[PDB]
């Protein structure tokens, strides 16, 4: 449910 940061993955 936690949104990932702009730079994640």
């Amino acid at each position, epitope marked *: 449910l936690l*949104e990932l*940061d*702009k*730079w*994640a993955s």
Partner: antibody
Amino acid sequence: RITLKESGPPLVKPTQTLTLTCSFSGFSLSDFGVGVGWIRQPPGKALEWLAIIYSDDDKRYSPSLNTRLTITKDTSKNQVVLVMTRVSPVDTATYFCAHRRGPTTLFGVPIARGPVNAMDVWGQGITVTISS
Amino acid sequence: ALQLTQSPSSLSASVGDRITITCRASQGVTSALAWYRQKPGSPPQLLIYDASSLESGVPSRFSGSGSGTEFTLTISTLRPEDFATYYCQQLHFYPHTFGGGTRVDVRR
């Protein structure tokens, strides 16, 4: 060299709207992946993250404050504005704006995202008190 | 809601000591964690970014390690300007959570 400075009213009354401005130099909000965020700190308390806006105009807000916050950027003026509505005394704190690096690029190609993992330069902070 | 817990919350030390501070996250945040030092009356200052990278201009006595849910900041030889409050920050998930801080003061 990057510098940021917060400005706004030192005093605001409950239910009123607080508008804070972050004026910066040394970078542009048209620079790839760069961000400017807002963090606050009640007297004697811990840091609390508020919001952030990027040069591509992507924005994010603290979930517990998103109904009262609006963040916007004026690219040409090198400013970022944070608007907080319906303030109450618990909103009194020192408000800081800060810079977040975008990924390192090589010949305009992103090669390292490690540098985005921090808010590297902060403003001196502006003290705001909410009282009637 | 992500939890970022610093330990200890307070610590006494003396000039010259080596101290470590930890930050534990409720969910993995990979290497996206930063450490700051904040002196009274000033804004926080970046020490370590990502989780172990030394920020330019920061003295080499500061070091960071860990990934996932456990991070630690260590100051090899405490200097006078290091008596302050330290904070960790998570930037893997929105919102970008800050730890509760750990006050480092003069032992007596």
